Design a protein around this ligand. Structure first.
Ligand SMILES: O=C(O)c1ccc(-c2nn(C(=O)c3c(Cl)cccc3C(F)(F)F)c3ccccc23)cc1
Ligand SMILES: C[C@H](CCCC(C)(C)O)[C@H]1CC[C@H]2[C@@H]3CC=C4C[C@@H](O)CC[C@]4(C)[C@H]3CC[C@]12C
Length: 241
């Protein structure tokens, strides 16, 4: 009906098509937990092997978020500089939010390579403080019990942010952001879920965690670089320079 009800539907559809893992599958698999043996198996792998596994999973996760963006109304009519600026600042913020779906707060486990495991799975990477910050962020998001439509609309707003430094057509990003803000508010009101607004992470916290993650990924990429077929080569070239 309204341009806004369609925008809600097209964001939720984009998300459904790019969500990478199905929520019912992730909820169904929570009982499928790595044994002590499988865990010491991961812990004994080289840093460089665990880095190769985790780098490729994270790159693929980023590629689902790039596709999500490309399918948001108006994203493809932004100039290429602004597309790169938004995804560079936002795509890994969206991956970190998407993680909460694959996270079980009851035993603090994440779905990884077909089973749930704790952060000790990743010991060989020697990243314990950063990995702990990532699990704690997922742990605090788990309390919101995001619906699929909430996660879709919230992650759209994570990407479409006119405050990112470097934008060339700030007013064009503002028009998309305000339509998505109205879509999000409208949807929460229609579903009696406005209470999540007071509980969303402070913007500073997501940007800060994302900044520490990407800096650590860039250090590993520097020491032991992986390659992938770039989904968005201009963005890829600006991360893997
Ligand atoms: O397929 C692509 O076009 C593409 C695929 C991935 C990205 C992208 N990688 N990335 C990383 O942090 C990253 C990852 Cl996930 C794995 C290994 C090394 C890295 C690092 F070198 F960049 F640090 C990002 C952060 C923020 C935003 C986009 C990306 C960008 C583009
Ligand atoms: C927290 C750990 C370790 C990160 C290690 C470091 C800091 C070197 O990158 C990472 C490794 C792999 C990541 C998952 C990859 C894919 C997905 C699917 C996506 O839909 C949601 C996020 C998730 C589950 C990632 C979570 C973070 C993981 C476990």
């Amino acid at each position: 009906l309204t341009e806004i009800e369609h925008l809600v539907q097209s964001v939720c559809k984009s998300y459904r098509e790019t969500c990478q893992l199905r929520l019912e599958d992730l909820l169904r698999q929570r009982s499928n937990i790595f044994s002590r043996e499988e865990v010491t198996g991961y812990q004994r792998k080289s840093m460089w092997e665990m880095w190769e596994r985790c780098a490729h999973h994270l790159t693929e996760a980023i590629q689902y978020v790039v596709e999500f963006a490309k399918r948001l109304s108006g994203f493809m009519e932004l100039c290429q500089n602004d597309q790169i600026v938004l995804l560079k600042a936002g795509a890994m913020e969206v991956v970190l939010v998407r993680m909460c779906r694959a996270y079980n707060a009851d035993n603090r486990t994440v779905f990884f390579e077909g089973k749930y495991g704790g952060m000790e799975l990743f010991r060989a990477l020697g990243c314990s403080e950063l990995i702990s910050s990532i699990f704690d962020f997922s742990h605090s998001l788990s309390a919101l019990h995001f619906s699929e439509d909430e996660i879709a609309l919230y992650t759209a707003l994570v990407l479409i942010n006119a405050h990112r430094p470097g934008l060339q057509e700030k007013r064009k990003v503002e028009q998309l952001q305000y339509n998505l803000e109205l879509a999000f508010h409208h949807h929460l009101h229609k579903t009696h879920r406005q209470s999540i607004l007071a509980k969303l992470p402070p913007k500073g916290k997501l940007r800060s965690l994302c900044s520490q993650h990407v800096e650590r990924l860039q250090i590993f990429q520097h020491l032991h670089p992986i390659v992938v077929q770039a989904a968005f080569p201009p963005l890829y070239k600006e991360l893997f320079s």
